[PDB]
Structure 1
Amino acid sequence: QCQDVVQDVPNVDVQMLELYDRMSFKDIDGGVWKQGWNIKYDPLKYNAHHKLKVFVVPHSHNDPGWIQTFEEYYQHDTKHILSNALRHLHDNPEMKFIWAEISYFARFYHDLGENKKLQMKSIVKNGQLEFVTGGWVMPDEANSHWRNVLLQLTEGQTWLKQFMNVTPTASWAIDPFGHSPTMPYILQKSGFKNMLIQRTHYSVKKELAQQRQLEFLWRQIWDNKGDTALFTHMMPFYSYDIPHTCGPDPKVCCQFDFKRMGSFGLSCPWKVPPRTISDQNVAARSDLLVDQWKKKAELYRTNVLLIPLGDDFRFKQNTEWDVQRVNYERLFEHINSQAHFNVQAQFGTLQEYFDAVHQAERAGQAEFPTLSGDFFTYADRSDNYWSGYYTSRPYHKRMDRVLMHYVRAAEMLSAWHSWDGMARIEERLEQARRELSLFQHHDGITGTAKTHVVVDYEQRMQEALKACQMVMQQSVYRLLTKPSIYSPDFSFSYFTLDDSRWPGSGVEDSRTTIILGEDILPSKHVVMHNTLPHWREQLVDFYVSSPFVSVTDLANNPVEAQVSPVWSWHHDTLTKTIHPQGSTTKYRIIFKARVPPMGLATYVLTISDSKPEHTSYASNLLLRKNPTSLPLGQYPEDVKFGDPREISLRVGNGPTLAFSEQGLLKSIQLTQDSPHVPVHFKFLKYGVRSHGDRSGAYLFLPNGPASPVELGQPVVLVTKGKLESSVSVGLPSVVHQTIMRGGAPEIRNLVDIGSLDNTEIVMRLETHIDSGDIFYTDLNGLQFIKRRRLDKLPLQANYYPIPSGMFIEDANTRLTLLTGQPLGGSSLASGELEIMQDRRLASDDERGLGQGVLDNKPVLHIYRLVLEKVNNCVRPSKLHPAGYLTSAAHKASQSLLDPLDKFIFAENEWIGAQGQFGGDHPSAREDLDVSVMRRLTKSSAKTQRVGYVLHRTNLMQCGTPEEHTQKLDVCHLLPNVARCERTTLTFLQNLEHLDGMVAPEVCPMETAAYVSSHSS
């Protein structure tokens, strides 16, 4: 039944890791096609019975924020482009236009009068205006999580189905900085038949062009059969602009961009301008243009040629529509009537191109190669590798992952019920989905926008977080109150969220202290939510106003707890040291919460006059020369002091960790008898070149290998508790923390690069694992791909996106680092892993941004560090291009991305409170997730519909015996099911009507969507 994703190496024509190993990457001058060669063709190839069919496809690339905000661009440019497109297409029936960004289209359409809405629907229905992809945005492919790529695709396509009655099946991605196979994975499971990409390494374009492998069936790296394959067209030249889309010579192609004659303020850098087409020049002009087209056609296998015609924010003025259309019409009339050219040229759309290509294929005219792999790291020229944007603006990269989880939790918690319109649930969820979707743009999460635009994205995401909080807390109140008591005010705050890691300690003072006291309030209810479909235990912490607090469940059973101080780190501008201060009135209480699958659990915190029976207190040790006292109020244990020294810690029966006198990990011992395995954390800095090209928001151009950060004699704080222990150290630019709860440690870095201009701070792990030149990184949080370090390429080319994790291994040992935020990283030597923390750059790097990166702010980065023995694991063979996590590493990743949510009851007494929700929910096998649960209907619908996206990962078999778990059938999670359907991942098309209304579980590495219908 299910394909084996481990043991069968797929046979493909092009495998990108193998291609990389073989290629020389020489940057030679190819002539007018600077990165290619002088293309030759046989004029006799095309004749009366075999013509070249040319589709000229007008387009306008509209960024939802970059140099201006979304709203600024909409007012100044996009509203005019769309208004003039409507008029010109209406009036010129043979003219065509494609549109990608639905965020702008929806903004425009809703402001149109009814007459114009009808005119717009007519030019879509008749095929003159065609939507390509139909996502909210054209997303980044490096830093984006697959869940958010799907979210933004669904937001745009749901809008298009409702208002335009169309669902695109061809994708257009002309600007993201490199390309991921996560895109065809999602698109192929969402009804698509074709896709187009542009930004791939210039050496790759040359190699594939020589073999006519620029069109290929792109399958996943583990897919032996090919059921994931999606037809893909890679454009051959340096850019998507008119000079780089007609053919190989931009000096010639520029003369066919009729906006560049002078009155529009544009010109041709190659110093030859366009000239208006006339009867006296059309033959010579056609001669030049057809020659360019026939050269481009030599790079592809069919007699159908794609010629994009557009650029950034084009087709804005009426006069521009006229100058492009009339000049091209004169060229077509001449070319199509001159038999000697053997060409038929016309305006077309993207779907028309692909339909004609496949007609040629079915006629036996061409066969296409198969391909697997990715297209990172991109370089557009010379040594200019775009690995900087894997890290740029890391505060907002972390915010993306926080909001990702809040959107999932808000949609899931509120899906369980139908809500009255007055509750504003659908309104708040639509706002949250749209702001997160907007940020997936290739100038949003990438960190490549102007400072004021980054601020706009941040403000939008903050409003989205508040919307999610409102929906979540209303839902908890409804799910856990006796129904005959429940009395909602839909504007009221019944609970506030408590989040320990966002914005984070030392970033914002945002958390509420639970205030208890004999003369005010003896106790407080708290509630935990678990969005994952299995029972889960996790330590949770709250701030409380007394150390004498104990925890009970809602059967009044005692729960073991630990109290620790609240520690904050300060850069002391007087003593010139970085050191911790403790609160004398706020304390942390920590306990293990146990929560049902997709469920809720209630606990109670109660004050007493002295130390409670079931609460313990951490010890605290400050290691520094020249200590001063550290009082802690009522906290029952005095802080201890010492000179810096090596130390060792063990929580529970977990690993024993040893630290240097500077507070940095040096070894991990997995069990009592086992070796102390060298595992060393180190912080280093990269700089910028003093001559030639400078690093900026896009480009990483280091001045050689990194240099160690000079640490001095830093202050180290050791907290030792029964449930949780930690070592924290104040280093220059980073407060580095290692936290132990009985399994793999959690690492937290509070990163403040301050005023350190032209500096990139990296965190490195040094081990003696014999990894050689191999390492693994993830793509969009979906799959792990094998990387090979290449010493034939510069340092920055060996940097890859780390959207959620990375690992190295040898025959016996693996080290995996999981992340709570996308960052850039590599393995630059055998046994090493490294990941960039932040970067501050004074210079612009010549890609259009027009500023450096000087707007850094403190960010709390989070990680888990998993050392494991892998000698017993069933792994792929040496030639397989994928890798897979273990159970422990996968659970560690879930602990970072989808932790328990914590709610504090906001008033004194919760009347009608219940102890648990979801105790009867199935606890599914650990590799299965309910990635999305979303109610699809409003309360007035007779038949309610709920959509689910189910994802199964693939975990290594390493000899841990399987325990039986329960089958998860999402179609029976809500009562009164009347129908269950398998759908596309966007929920927009029914694919299968399911027997017995049962939704089957999916295979490893597969994702499916189901919709259940319920009689209400």
Structure 2
Amino acid sequence: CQDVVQDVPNVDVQMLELYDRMSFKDIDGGVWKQGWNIKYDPLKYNAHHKLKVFVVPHSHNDPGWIQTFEEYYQHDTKHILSNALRHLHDNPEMKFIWAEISYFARFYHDLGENKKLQMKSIVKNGQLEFVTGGWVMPDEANSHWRNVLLQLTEGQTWLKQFMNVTPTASWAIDPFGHSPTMPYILQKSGFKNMLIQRTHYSVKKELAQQRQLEFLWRQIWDNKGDTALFTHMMPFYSYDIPHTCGPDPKVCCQFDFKRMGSFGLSCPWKVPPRTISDQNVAARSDLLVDQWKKKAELYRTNVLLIPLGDDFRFKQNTEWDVQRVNYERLFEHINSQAHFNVQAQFGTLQEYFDAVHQAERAGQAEFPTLSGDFFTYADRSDNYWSGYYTSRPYHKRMDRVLMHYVRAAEMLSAWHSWDGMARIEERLEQARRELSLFQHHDGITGTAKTHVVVDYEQRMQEALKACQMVMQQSVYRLLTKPSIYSPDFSFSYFTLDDSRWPGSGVEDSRTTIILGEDILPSKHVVMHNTLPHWREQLVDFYVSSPFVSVTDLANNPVEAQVSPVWSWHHDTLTTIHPQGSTTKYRIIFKARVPPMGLATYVLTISDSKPEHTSYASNLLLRKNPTSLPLGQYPEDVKFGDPREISLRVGNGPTLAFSEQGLLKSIQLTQDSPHVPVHFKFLKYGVRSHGDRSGAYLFLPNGPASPVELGQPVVLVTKGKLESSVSVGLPSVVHQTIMRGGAPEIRNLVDIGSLDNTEIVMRLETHIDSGDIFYTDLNGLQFIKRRRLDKLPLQANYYPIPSGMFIEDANTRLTLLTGQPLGGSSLASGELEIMQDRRLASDDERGLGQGVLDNKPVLHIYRLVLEKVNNCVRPSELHPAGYLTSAAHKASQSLLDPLDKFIFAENEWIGAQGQFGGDHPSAREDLDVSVMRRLTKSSAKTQRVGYVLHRTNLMQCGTPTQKLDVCHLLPNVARCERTTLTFLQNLEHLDGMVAPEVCPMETAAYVSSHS
């Protein structure tokens, strides 16, 4: 294994170092507004060295944006694909590339048997070519790497079964900035080439000047270079026809033949296209070849890519004819005139890449190496696209919940083959496809119309219910004696309890377990642990009585705590204040669950305070208190005036809070200093003159201003197992929760009718971080950031898909997230992260609406303060950072918590105590990211697929069983290493053993069973 800490990779272009050197000037470059007037040597090309030009027709089809998936399918995409089939069949020289498999699969299943055969023949002969072949073209900023792989797998599994093809070239023309997570996943999935478009106008200019727009893109930690993927970055402002022929859009627009005649379109530069004739073809070819030779000066070979398309193009038979016939008349003239020294023709993306690599092997070019990312994107002036890191944060949070439920449903159901009557495969295909659709660059981004967001939310809600049904049937099968198990596949044996989605203050839908010494004195509950190591964690349930004791199924007592149930309400006379339930209570205890396993507990009612259950105290801090009854709860609420508070659970850290209920300090141990750490809430506004913020753009009117808090009401709950401080602020109920290690932070965010406001949560410390901070990419890797005062505030905002940290020589503070949000370090010792944004104006990128559809959301975090002076850190020149053990486990507690199940009926005949006690407990840096049965019950050879991910953790001194996934299931007959999509066998494994993967590596295995 490579060492990913000590050796700094040597690359030609390192994006952090390039950013530090660049001046970012926004000069008028002439017809190429953000570049310069390109010149070429006309003697560069002759009889023996010609320019080869590939014109690649395409159509950008969004699976939801202005219309829903189904509205676009019926009104636009089914006509595009029907006309593609007819025109390519009739015109063998015509070519077309296709990206979005969600639409292609919907179309193909609706075709008659004769049309399916014709479609297969234009794919087999290479006229219709699939590019990427994902379900969608995903967002690269907010998306988790697990979901990027899920949607790639859904589309490529469909293409292999139905079209017998697997793309090796990727096409990503519309995501709002680009991540190195994509080449990481694509290179481990059989790809050879990829293309990107939306990068900062300043970066396009700097790379074009050095002919560094084609590069070998490696990971920031990769010293050897085996992660490298060949990447083509397009040079100009857009992927439309005016910005793809060459540097002058007033010329290129005249070669978009839909912008004349009866289509109702036109050229903004005021010179229309003209039909190509014998009379004009020499003059028209003179201007067009000059644009081609200028574009070719920006690249290193004699092979040139010219895309030809736009949004939902090639809808009409007449559009295919007017584009094909005028281009054919230009190609026939140009190819027949030796003075041009050009060969031009319709082609595909793979055709382009094959010809470039042939030119390279001929010794025509040697390509540069590059590491880094392409965030944050700007298309013009100070218009940085950091707004969509936060827009529609309710759905961003829902993405992470559905990610975990799909993993848990696939894993729990994989242990067995199921009868077709159970409909397990139907429910899991629905769930995978709804989560896959939401990865689209107008889904998770929050950049769709209000009615389109409602469609995404309804689809994700159906997917959640499908996962719940699979999970509960699987738990019953796994923990019921085989002598008793006799299933009704329609029946609810268990209901799921989730404390964190949507959250009891968002939707008060948790089930209360109702116990009574007569009617029903006990209830069985079951915890699942998807992680491949033993886990102990606190769990809670709602119960109808405070007098409840916990046992394991063997009747061993478990120490428990009871707390009241609290809700928060606006008083119309005055204040935001808490109200206690008189009818339900929380029971809280530590569950111990095997790796990838299950554990059963029992809740039992009694007359009075039972021997192994304690009761939290509650203190309400407010002047002029009124009474707060709590029904049977045995401890009276205490009252006081606002004051500073300190709390400690177990022998974990001591936290101190201000009179307003906000953190002010952390002490790690009894001996150590009180380290200042202050939470604050601030607000950004919108510019009254000049460019307005919208769903995409963040354009603040200066630095954030303090929120006036008044004298808010503070509630302190103190228990042996769990304590919290909760405060009612304007727009936010803010909670700090303590269970004996790093605290958990919960914000119930309701921005209400506060038009043109963005709410930010900031941390202030004396950590001497200077201009340096770290943010993650897609939940996979931490990248070093440098704050730049020469760029505006909105340019120093980055995606926070799962975490961020600052550090000096001695101390680090990490904030882990349960949802992707936008964030920064705008001053030494600070972290900040945006909670919600409400915007009255459109930002002129095509959405045609502001963001005024906000709803309450529960955001969740962990906060980890650590000493790092005894840690082996990367050298100052390394562009990556790495989490500690404690911060990594804190992230895992937010993204993949224990699942909780309540038995639905009065009696569970044949109940068992535990599943998976024999499972291997793997090293803490290893995860089983995916477990998925690949075969239905009728297959004679069963196949199960596993994705294994090993992260890299910092070594800090304080230093388990070998996991072989090929032997988790009995009767293993073969074990293969595969691409991450499971579609190609790469290696038949010695001894049917799936080996140990290296730090920062991901591998896929398939086990076959007799």
TM-score under structure 2 length normalisation: 1.00
Q: Deviations over 1:379-420 (max 9, x none)?
A: 000000000000000000000000000000000000000000
Structure 2 counterpart of 1:1008: 1003
Structure 1 counterpart of 2:47: 48
For residues 468 and 572 of structure 2, the distance between their equivalents in structure 1, rounded to whole angstroms, comes to 37
For residues 252 and 518 of structure 2, the distance between their equivalents in structure 1, rounded to whole angstroms, comes to 81
Please state how far the C-alpha of 1:262 moved relative to its aligned partner: 4.4
Structure 1 counterpart of 2:688: 690
Q: Deviations over 1:900-946 (max 9, x none)?
A: 00000000011110000000000000000000000000000010000
For residues 626 and 313 of structure 1, the distance between their equivalents in structure 2, rounded to whole angstroms, comes to 64
| Partner secondary structure for residue 156 of structure 2 | helix
| Partner secondary structure for residue 257 of structure 2 | coil
| Partner secondary structure for residue 512 of structure 2 | coil
Please state how far the C-alpha of 1:554 moved relative to its aligned partner: 1.2
Paired positions, count: 1010
Residue 737 in 1 paired to residue 749 in 2? no
Contact kept, 8 Å, 2:512 with 2:544, in 1: the verdict is yes
Q: Deviations over 1:610-642 (max 9, x none)?
A: 111000000000001121110001000000000
For residues 814 and 753 of structure 1, the distance between their equivalents in structure 2, rounded to whole angstroms, comes to 31
Residue 979 in 1 paired to residue 974 in 2? yes
| Partner secondary structure for residue 711 of structure 1 | coil
Q: Deviations over 1:717-745 (max 9, x none)?
A: 00000000000000000000000000000
Question: What is the aligned counterpart of 2:670 among 672, 675, 678?
Answer: 672
For residues 580 and 487 of structure 1, the distance between their equivalents in structure 2, rounded to whole angstroms, comes to 47
Question: What is the aligned counterpart of 1:933 among 931, 934, 938?
Answer: 931
Contact kept, 8 Å, 2:621 with 2:713, in 1: the verdict is yes
Bigger CA drift: 565-574 or 783-792? 565-574
For residues 344 and 512 of structure 2, the distance between their equivalents in structure 1, rounded to whole angstroms, comes to 70
1:588-599 to structure 2, matched below 5 A, reads 588-599=586-597
For residues 800 and 379 of structure 2, the distance between their equivalents in structure 1, rounded to whole angstroms, comes to 21
For residues 422 and 246 of structure 1, the distance between their equivalents in structure 2, rounded to whole angstroms, comes to 56
Percentage identity across aligned positions?
A: 100
Q: Deviations over 1:543-567 (max 9, x none)?
A: 0000000000111100000000000
Please state how far the C-alpha of 1:574 moved relative to its aligned partner: 3.1
Contact kept, 8 Å, 2:472 with 2:901, in 1: the verdict is yes
Structure 1 counterpart of 2:370: 371
Bigger CA drift: 480-489 or 171-180? 480-489
Residue 411 in 1 paired to residue 410 in 2? yes
For residues 360 and 348 of structure 1, the distance between their equivalents in structure 2, rounded to whole angstroms, comes to 17
Residue 622 in 1 paired to residue 625 in 2? no
Please state how far the C-alpha of 1:503 moved relative to its aligned partner: 0.2
Please state how far the C-alpha of 1:572 moved relative to its aligned partner: 1.9
| Partner secondary structure for residue 635 of structure 2 | coil
Please state how far the C-alpha of 1:356 moved relative to its aligned partner: 0.2
For residues 386 and 262 of structure 1, the distance between their equivalents in structure 2, rounded to whole angstroms, comes to 36
| Partner secondary structure for residue 76 of structure 2 | helix
Structure 2 counterpart of 1:440: 439
For residues 530 and 76 of structure 2, the distance between their equivalents in structure 1, rounded to whole angstroms, comes to 42
| Partner secondary structure for residue 80 of structure 2 | helix
For residues 3 and 304 of structure 2, the distance between their equivalents in structure 1, rounded to whole angstroms, comes to 39
For residues 556 and 886 of structure 2, the distance between their equivalents in structure 1, rounded to whole angstroms, comes to 30
Please state how far the C-alpha of 1:505 moved relative to its aligned partner: 2.1
Please state how far the C-alpha of 1:573 moved relative to its aligned partner: 2.1
Please state how far the C-alpha of 1:657 moved relative to its aligned partner: 0.1
Please state how far the C-alpha of 1:484 moved relative to its aligned partner: 1.7
Q: Deviations over 1:751-778 (max 9, x none)?
A: 0000000000000000010000000000
Please state how far the C-alpha of 1:859 moved relative to its aligned partner: 0.2
Alpha-carbon RMSD: 0.4
Please state how far the C-alpha of 1:686 moved relative to its aligned partner: 0.1
For residues 656 and 236 of structure 1, the distance between their equivalents in structure 2, rounded to whole angstroms, comes to 54
1:879-958 to structure 2, matched below 5 A, reads 879-958=877-956
For residues 327 and 871 of structure 1, the distance between their equivalents in structure 2, rounded to whole angstroms, comes to 69
For residues 518 and 288 of structure 2, the distance between their equivalents in structure 1, rounded to whole angstroms, comes to 87
Bigger CA drift: 514-523 or 929-938? 514-523
| Partner secondary structure for residue 924 of structure 1 | coil
| Partner secondary structure for residue 223 of structure 1 | coil
Please state how far the C-alpha of 1:487 moved relative to its aligned partner: 1.1
For residues 37 and 285 of structure 1, the distance between their equivalents in structure 2, rounded to whole angstroms, comes to 23
For residues 98 and 645 of structure 1, the distance between their equivalents in structure 2, rounded to whole angstroms, comes to 66
For residues 52 and 562 of structure 1, the distance between their equivalents in structure 2, rounded to whole angstroms, comes to 76
Structure 1: which 5+ residue stretches go unaligned? none
For residues 262 and 590 of structure 1, the distance between their equivalents in structure 2, rounded to whole angstroms, comes to 72
| Partner secondary structure for residue 726 of structure 1 | strand
Structure 2 counterpart of 1:260: 259
Contact kept, 8 Å, 2:694 with 2:841, in 1: the verdict is yes
Q: Deviations over 1:457-503 (max 9, x none)?
A: 00000000000000000000000000121011111100010000000
Q: Deviations over 1:422-476 (max 9, x none)?
A: 0000000000000000000000000000000000000000000000000000000
| Partner secondary structure for residue 499 of structure 1 | coil
For residues 821 and 424 of structure 2, the distance between their equivalents in structure 1, rounded to whole angstroms, comes to 34
| Partner secondary structure for residue 804 of structure 2 | strand
Contact kept, 8 Å, 2:885 with 2:954, in 1: the verdict is yes
For residues 850 and 148 of structure 1, the distance between their equivalents in structure 2, rounded to whole angstroms, comes to 29
Please state how far the C-alpha of 1:42 moved relative to its aligned partner: 0.5
Please state how far the C-alpha of 1:504 moved relative to its aligned partner: 0.4
Please state how far the C-alpha of 1:265 moved relative to its aligned partner: 1.6
| Partner secondary structure for residue 853 of structure 2 | coil
Please state how far the C-alpha of 1:604 moved relative to its aligned partner: 0.3
For residues 303 and 567 of structure 2, the distance between their equivalents in structure 1, rounded to whole angstroms, comes to 65
Please state how far the C-alpha of 1:518 moved relative to its aligned partner: 2.0
Structure 2: which 5+ residue stretches go unaligned? none
Structure 2 counterpart of 1:657: 655
Bigger CA drift: 435-444 or 508-517? 508-517
Bigger CA drift: 796-805 or 566-575? 566-575
For residues 577 and 885 of structure 2, the distance between their equivalents in structure 1, rounded to whole angstroms, comes to 38
For residues 383 and 436 of structure 2, the distance between their equivalents in structure 1, rounded to whole angstroms, comes to 29
For residues 619 and 74 of structure 1, the distance between their equivalents in structure 2, rounded to whole angstroms, comes to 58
For residues 495 and 164 of structure 1, the distance between their equivalents in structure 2, rounded to whole angstroms, comes to 41
| Partner secondary structure for residue 592 of structure 1 | strand
Please state how far the C-alpha of 1:1007 moved relative to its aligned partner: 0.1
For residues 510 and 361 of structure 1, the distance between their equivalents in structure 2, rounded to whole angstroms, comes to 62
Please state how far the C-alpha of 1:519 moved relative to its aligned partner: 3.0
Contact kept, 8 Å, 2:57 with 2:96, in 1: the verdict is yes
For residues 289 and 176 of structure 2, the distance between their equivalents in structure 1, rounded to whole angstroms, comes to 31
For residues 548 and 721 of structure 1, the distance between their equivalents in structure 2, rounded to whole angstroms, comes to 16
For residues 263 and 830 of structure 1, the distance between their equivalents in structure 2, rounded to whole angstroms, comes to 60
| Partner secondary structure for residue 513 of structure 2 | coil
For residues 478 and 468 of structure 1, the distance between their equivalents in structure 2, rounded to whole angstroms, comes to 16
1:138-157 to structure 2, matched below 5 A, reads 138-157=137-156
Q: Deviations over 1:231-278 (max 9, x none)?
A: 000000000000000000000000000000141121110111100101
Contact kept, 8 Å, 2:504 with 2:510, in 1: the verdict is no
For residues 263 and 492 of structure 2, the distance between their equivalents in structure 1, rounded to whole angstroms, comes to 55
| Partner secondary structure for residue 958 of structure 1 | coil
Structure 1 counterpart of 2:993: 998
Structure 1 counterpart of 2:492: 493
For residues 269 and 909 of structure 1, the distance between their equivalents in structure 2, rounded to whole angstroms, comes to 73
Please state how far the C-alpha of 1:1010 moved relative to its aligned partner: 0.1
For residues 477 and 737 of structure 1, the distance between their equivalents in structure 2, rounded to whole angstroms, comes to 36
Q: Deviations over 1:53-96 (max 9, x none)?
A: 00000000000000000000000000000000000000000000
For residues 671 and 825 of structure 1, the distance between their equivalents in structure 2, rounded to whole angstroms, comes to 30
Contact kept, 8 Å, 2:215 with 2:367, in 1: the verdict is yes
Please state how far the C-alpha of 1:750 moved relative to its aligned partner: 0.2
Q: Deviations over 1:764-805 (max 9, x none)?
A: 000010000000000000000000000000000000000000
Contact kept, 8 Å, 2:527 with 2:593, in 1: the verdict is yes
Q: Deviations over 1:334-353 (max 9, x none)?
A: 00000000000000000000
For residues 17 and 734 of structure 2, the distance between their equivalents in structure 1, rounded to whole angstroms, comes to 39
Please state how far the C-alpha of 1:520 moved relative to its aligned partner: 1.8
For residues 553 and 941 of structure 2, the distance between their equivalents in structure 1, rounded to whole angstroms, comes to 36
For residues 866 and 334 of structure 1, the distance between their equivalents in structure 2, rounded to whole angstroms, comes to 68
| Partner secondary structure for residue 411 of structure 1 | helix
Q: Deviations over 1:118-137 (max 9, x none)?
A: 00000000000000000000
For residues 661 and 574 of structure 1, the distance between their equivalents in structure 2, rounded to whole angstroms, comes to 23
Please state how far the C-alpha of 1:659 moved relative to its aligned partner: 0.0
Residue 584 in 1 paired to residue 582 in 2? yes
